[PDB]
Scaffold this active site. Structure first.
Site, PDB file in Angstrom:
ATOM      1  N   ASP A 734       0.793  -1.223   0.000  1.00  0.00           N
ATOM      2  CA  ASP A 734       0.000   0.000   0.000  1.00  0.00           C
ATOM      3  C   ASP A 734       0.826   1.273   0.000  1.00  0.00           C
ATOM      4  OD1 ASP A 734      -2.244  -1.730   0.315  1.00  0.00           O
ATOM      5  OD2 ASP A 734      -1.885  -1.710   2.480  1.00  0.00           O
ATOM      6  N   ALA A 735       2.143   1.197   0.150  1.00  0.00           N
ATOM      7  CA  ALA A 735       2.964   2.397   0.102  1.00  0.00           C
ATOM      8  C   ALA A 735       2.902   3.038  -1.279  1.00  0.00           C
ATOM      9  CB  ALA A 735       4.403   2.062   0.467  1.00  0.00           C
TER      10      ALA A 735
END
Ligand SMILES: [Zn+2]
Ligand SMILES: [Zn+2]
Lengths: 1102, 83, 48, 67
Positions: A734-735
């Site tokens: 999700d970064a």
């Protein structure tokens, strides 16, 4: 171009919201309160009397809010934003007229003030009512502010919509293992609220009441209620059914098992257990106590020699219990939206005001007594001084209840908290979704997910996606877009109309045929039977459609329980639906043409019977069509617009029907935290905390709800050029990858604005605080701590303040002559700027200082972003533009969204949004992602191909670091991105040594108090499982609280200074280190006299 | 309390992970208290890394005392415990 | 066990109340009024 | 608030296009797409910068505190 009703019927929704807004529950309830309930409270407590002096009566003839009769115009109210600035309550006076008699036979009026009523914003009494944005600008108000909340002490307080069970209604509820069946009605009359249970115990039906001392056999109660034939009891609770009669015969026989009975005997048996009445009117403990025993047994007041109504009520409740005993699944579902009522701000404030007014009147009567209790010199002149001085208690009580959210109502005798919440100003949508919020009733047994479950019956009544995460999940619910909360309508004319329509009264009929025809109910109370129930229901609905009965009155026929129910109470949630008759919808596009022309507003669609409100129970009988293209002759109603099943907040999501539902709920959470524009006056505001985006952009793909609720006017986000590809390896889990030089050009830029309030208060010794300061050094140069202070001692506007610098120089008297310094220091990791210093006075005369500190923020690693689809993630790397991949035109992404976040989360709406937004920018048009609709994917593909791009949105890109064509085509286009309030600048915390608790000597618990990070029991378990003993000692004792105590080796009791102070020797005192928490535990045990004596031994000597 | 002679020792001739961690910690603590070292530092200034080097050369002068649950113990020098 | 003093069964009856050190029941500076405020255990023992 | 000077993505100067785009929409009324293309905003990032901008400064200026 002619109106196509299969697509123009959605215009009923803007027409509806034009006259019944999103914040209309609050506004309507407050208007009803200040327009009828104040008059009703005054009429109820019209006269207050004293025991002495019968030649004295003090009358309450008229009440008003905010307007005298001396001037036609209204009173001057301080504008709400001025109240916000000066930390005052936005309130209007409460004017009454008084008939108080003079001694020399004089009768007169007046117009006196008995306090201040806090005014809900944009109510009838609000100055903001009917202002045209020029008055709003002059008043420093945003025209897009919802209203519906209070300003008490400068704080915006919303009284949240409360959801409770229907009062005065029977809920049957069975059980397992225990095998009881319990039917209960909560009888909430005006003066009393009691619960009347009808339990099952050992196969026998009983009645249980809080007032009654013992559970009473049910046949005894049915005899006490005039039903003594002992055969009609069977005919009332079983009718003709072999099973039910068999079940109830036990109670029938237990009636006689005590003894044979008459009515008065059963009344005596009831009266022998009525507990007491606080030892007043003690002369009534006889058979004459049964009367109030039975008229307190429910909400049906019987005031005569007939018990038909109450007897049949008890019999129907008993029949319900018997039907549940025979056939389980015949019990009511407590989480059914038809069983829920929503109480509103107006009703809450009405109860609060009535109680405060009763306390006011009691105290006023006592003061009158004190004034008139003298033998001589008892002139009546100015009896109203005690009202000039006791009026502040109404104002104080209202302000305190709204401010704290605690509601101490003595009459109903309950102490509830959390009634009011601070209006969340994180975003425009945050405030809007704070309104239309509904808090569920407490004591729900939160261990289970029964109420937490989403009910099918909430369709179109409560938003299907707007529920919080965390503990509250289904406990907080939000209103759907197009709903209405009914109002109390009088049941008397409706009962007369039922009698006119063929309902023979409940007193003309016999018991044998009672369960042969449908019985007509009225707010749960049986008022007679009906022949041809369906014809009766049809005629009643015709009367409602033609406007003869109120449109919020619902009728529905239950077929299992043969009944026709009519509901007239308020708090029912309902939504408008298009009536379908004879297989045709009644709108037929001529009314749509008139509606679009401007005439024929929404309420004309009710005054012509084209639409009607259905509550949840009427939908149990309806047959609703989603679209006009699938109406069958069996159907009764047509949906106005199916996306209205989502509330205001979920209406931000583009294509929510292509996403997996948890992602839609996550976006409901994230949108409230999106940083954006707050209001048109957001720079005139001085708020405790405010996150503002520098360059807000409206979404490329909006929805109908976005423009309905005006989110396109105060958007929270920016349209990031997004490439969905794995990149650099800092975008895993999700970064996000953020483009430097998009950030440099202002992408994601935001500012924090924080307020600090000080009061230069006044003191009993004729002293006050001062803001003297700005001292200098030898050169005449200001010292560093006063570098940006200015002569007045209040930080200069425009100047930077760094960590350690003073911006309010508050000196407090040392004897509140001499002034101890109490400066307001800026303690921030990063410098701030002073943009507003407001000097003012509060309502209580004393100076008020507010300084607003602004802090421009640039996105960094760990800052949180989200894309309206629940795909949040921190910035994991900021790369230079040349490292980013580029297309044929040199466009580079502002953000790179990792492709692994799609396959598991299944947010296809995000891909459709990328394509729709791309086609939209290329075509020059904003696109639509409206639920169950929006811009069609193939039309967007046609635009993309016509513009030269691939239909699927996949451009061929070049690598930024190598320059070669990437071997995969990259999904590439605009996506709306929100910068969430969670910024790592506010989260980074590191403690080496700092403050410790005075009690435990352990590091503080607050990130603001430089607290340490707790090492809990689970981390302790992990370290034990590693077998790291020395690390256990270091983390828990040495680096939290290590205390070098002195321990006596004779008595295991800690001493001091090497002194046993019980042996008084200093011989056997050993010195050792133990946790200060352990020392504290030993000293606490010695307090309770417990002596935890420590036995020692040499570590060495083998 | 009795020392089992080196001739007859029942416990493992292998240093356990706990014994290694404790030996390193104790030796590093001693070194941080300016204890002389028996290896060539080669620029190392950290006591734990010095102690790791000494363990790699089997030059740590400490003895493991392995108490049996009955109370008896046996002594294993760090050199002889095989890793 | 009656070998040691306080092993008697009469010691379990409250006959002397030990007053805990004020560190166990600290007095918090500058709460509400300028006058110092006390805490619950101290108030209770004052009542006792 | 006020139109960004540069496209966030390409860096092209779009801050001199806002008034002329408003004029093209209001006077000699054109479609948004044709108005954007007439200003040289060919890349869709540059088109976005103008098409999606919300001119909040004009609302914020209604609350002028130094009237
Ligand atoms: Zn001692
Ligand atoms: Zn561009």
């Amino acid at each position: 171009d002619e109106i196509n009703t299969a697509q123009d019927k959605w215009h009923l929704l803007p027409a509806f919201l034009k006259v019944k807004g999103l914040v209309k529950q609050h506004l309507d309830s407050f208007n009803y309160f200040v327009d009828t309930d104040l008059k009703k409270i005054i009429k109820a407590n019209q006269l207050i009397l004293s025991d002495v002096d019968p030649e004295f009566y003090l009358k309450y003839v008229d009440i008003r809010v905010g307007k005298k009769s001396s001037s036609s115009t209204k009173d001057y109210l301080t504008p709400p934003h001025e109240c916000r600035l000066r930390d005052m309550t936005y309130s209007a006076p409460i004017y009454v007229d008084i008939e108080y008699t003079r001694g020399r036979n004089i009768i007169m009026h007046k117009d006196v003030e008995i306090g201040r009523m806090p005014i809900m914003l944009r109510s009838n009494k609000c100055i903001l009512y009917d202002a045209d944005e020029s008055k709003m600008a002059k008043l420093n108000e945003c025209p897009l502010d919802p209203g519906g909340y209070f300003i008490v002490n400068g704080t915006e307080k919303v009284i949240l919509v409360q959801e409770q069970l229907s009062k005065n209604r029977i809920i049957v509820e069975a059980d397992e293992k225990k095998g009881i069946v319990q039917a209960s009605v909560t009888s909430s009359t005006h003066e009393r609220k009691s619960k009347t249970y009808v339990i099952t115990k050992n196969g026998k039906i009983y009645l249980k009441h809080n007032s009654i001392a013992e559970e009473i056999p049910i046949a005894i109660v049915l005899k006490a209620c005039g039903i003594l034939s002992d055969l009609e009891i069977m005919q009332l609770v079983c009718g003709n059914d072999s099973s039910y009669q068999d079940i109830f015969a036990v109670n029938l026989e237990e009636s006689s098992k005590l003894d044979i009975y008459t009515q008065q005997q059963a009344l005596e048996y009831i009266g022998a257990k009525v507990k007491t009445m606080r030892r007043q009117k003690l002369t009534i403990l006889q058979e004459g106590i049964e009367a109030i025993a039975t008229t307190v047994i429910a909400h049906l007041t019987v005031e005569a020699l007939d018990f038909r109504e109450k007897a049949l009520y008890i019999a129907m409740m008993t029949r319900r219990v018997v039907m549940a005993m025979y056939n389980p699944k015949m019990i009511d579902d407590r989480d059914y939206v038809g069983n829920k009522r929503l109480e509103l701000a107006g009703q809450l404030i009405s109860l609060l005001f009535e109680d405060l007014f009763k306390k006011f009147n009691n105290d006023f009567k006592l003061s009158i007594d004190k004034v008139l209790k003298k033998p001589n010199r008892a002139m009546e002149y100015d009896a109203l001084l005690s009202i000039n001085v006791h009026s502040n208690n109404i104002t104080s009580g209202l302000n305190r209840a709204i401010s704290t959210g605690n509601w101490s109502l003595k009459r109903f005798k309950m102490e509830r908290a959390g009634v009011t919440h601070v209006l969340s100003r994180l975003s425009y949508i945050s405030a809007l979704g704070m309104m239309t919020r509904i808090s569920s009733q407490f004591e729900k047994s939160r261990k289970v997910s029964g109420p937490r479950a989403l009910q099918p019956s909430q369709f179109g009544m409560l938003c299907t996606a707007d529920t919080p995460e965390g503990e509250a999940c289904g406990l907080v619910k939000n209103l759907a877009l197009m709903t209405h909360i009914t109002t109390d309508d009088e049941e008397e004319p409706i009962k007369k109309l039922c009698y006119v329509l063929g309902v023979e009264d409940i007193t003309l009929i016999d018991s044998a045929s009672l369960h042969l025809n449908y019985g007509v109910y009225l707010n749960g109370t049986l008022i007679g039977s009906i022949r041809f129930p369906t014809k009766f229901v049809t005629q009643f609905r015709h009367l409602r459609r033609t406007g003869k009965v109120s449109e919020f009155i619902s009728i529905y026929s239950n077929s299992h329980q043969m009944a026709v129910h009519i509901a007239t109470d308020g708090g029912r949630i309902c939504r408008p639906l298009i009536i379908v008759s004879d297989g045709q919808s009644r709108v037929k596009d001529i009314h749509l043409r008139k509606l679009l022309d401007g005439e024929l507003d929404f309420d004309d669609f009710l005054k012509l019977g084209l639409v009607e409100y259905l509550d949840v129970n009427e939908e149990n009988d309806s047959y609703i069509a989603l679209y006009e293209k699938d109406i069958v002759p069996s159907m009764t109603h047509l949906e106005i617009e199916p996306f209205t099943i989502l509330g205001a907040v979920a209406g931000l999501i583009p294509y929510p029907h292509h996403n997996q539902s948890p992602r839609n709920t996550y976006q409901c959470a994230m949108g409230k935290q999106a940083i954006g524009a707050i209001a048109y006056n957001q720079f005139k505001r001085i708020d405790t905390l405010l996150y503002l985006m520098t360059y807000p952009q409206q979404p490329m793909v909006k929805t109908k709800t976005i423009e309905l609720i005006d989110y396109d006017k105060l958007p929270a986000g920016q349209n990031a050029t997004v490439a969905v590809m794995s990149y650099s390896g800092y975008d895993i889990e999700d970064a996000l990858v953020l483009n430097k030089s998009s950030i440099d050009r202002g992408f994601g830029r935001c500012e924090t604005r924080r307020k600090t309030t000080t009061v230069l208060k006044r003191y009993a010794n004729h002293t006050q605080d001062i803001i003297g300061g700005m001292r200098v050094d030898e050169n005449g140069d200001p010292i560093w701590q006063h570098q940006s202070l200015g002569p007045d001692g209040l930080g200069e506007v425009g100047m930077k303040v760094q960590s350690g610098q003073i911006y309010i120089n508050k000196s407090v008297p040392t004897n509140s002559t001499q002034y101890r310094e109490a400066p307001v220091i800026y303690r921030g990791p990063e410098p701030s700027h002073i943009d507003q210093v407001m000097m003012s006075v509060s309502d209580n005369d004393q100076a008020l200082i507010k300084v607003l500190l602004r802090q421009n923020r640039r996105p960094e690693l760990g800052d949180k972003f989200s894309s309206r689809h629940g795909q949040k993630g921190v910035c994991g790397i900021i790369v230079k533009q040349e490292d980013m991949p580029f297309n044929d035109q040199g466009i580079v992404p502002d953000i790179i969204m990792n492709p692994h976040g799609f396959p598991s989360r299944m947010t296809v709406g995000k891909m459709i949004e990328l394509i729709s937004g791309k086609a939209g920018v290329l075509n020059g048009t904003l696109e639509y992602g409206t639920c169950f609709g929006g811009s069609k994917l193939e039309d967007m593909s046609k635009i993309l191909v016509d513009q030269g791009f691939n239909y699927s949105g996949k451009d061929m890109l070049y690598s930024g670091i190598t320059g070669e064509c990437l071997q995969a085509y990259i999904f590439f286009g605009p996506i709306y991105y929100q910068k969430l309030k969670h910024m790592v600048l506010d989260k980074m915390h590191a403690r080496a040594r700092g403050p410790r608790a005075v009690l435990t000597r352990q590091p503080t618990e607050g990130r603001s108090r430089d607290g340490g990070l707790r090492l809990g029991e689970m981390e302790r378990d992990c370290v034990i499982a590693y077998g790291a003993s020395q690390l256990l000692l270091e983390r828990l004792m040495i680096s939290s609280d290590a205390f070098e105590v002195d321990v006596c080796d004779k008595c295991g009791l800690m001493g001091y200074s090497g002194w046993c102070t019980t042996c008084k020797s200093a011989e056997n005192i050993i010195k050792m280190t133990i946790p200060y928490a352990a020392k504290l535990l030993f000293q606490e045990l010695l307090s309770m006299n417990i002596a935890p004596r420590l036995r020692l031994e040499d570590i060495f000597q083998q | 309390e009795k020392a089992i002679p080196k001739d007859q020792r029942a416990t493992t001739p292998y240093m356990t992970k706990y014994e290694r961690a404790r030996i390193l910690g104790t030796r590093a603590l001693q070194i941080s208290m300016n204890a002389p070292v028996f290896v060539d530092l080669e620029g190392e200034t950290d006591p734990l890394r010095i102690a790791m080097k000494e363990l790699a050369e089997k030059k740590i002068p400490l003895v493991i005392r392995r108490y049996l649950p009955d109370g008896s113990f046996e002594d294993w020098s760090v050199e002889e415990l095989i890793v | 066990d009656a070998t040691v003093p306080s092993g008697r069964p009469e010691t379990y009856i409250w006959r002397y109340l030990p007053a805990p050190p004020v560190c166990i029941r600290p007095s918090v500076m500058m709460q509400d009024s300028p006058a110092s405020n006390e805490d619950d255990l101290t108030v209770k023992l004052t009542e006792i | 608030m006020i139109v960004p000077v540069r496209c966030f993505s390409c860096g092209k100067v779009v801050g001199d296009k806002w008034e002329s785009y408003l004029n093209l929409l209001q006077e000699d009324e054109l479609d948004e797409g044709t108005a954007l293309s007439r200003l040289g905003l060919k890349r869709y990032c540059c088109r976005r910068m103008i098409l999606t901008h919300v001119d909040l400064i004009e609302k914020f200026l209604r609350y002028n505190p130094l009237e």
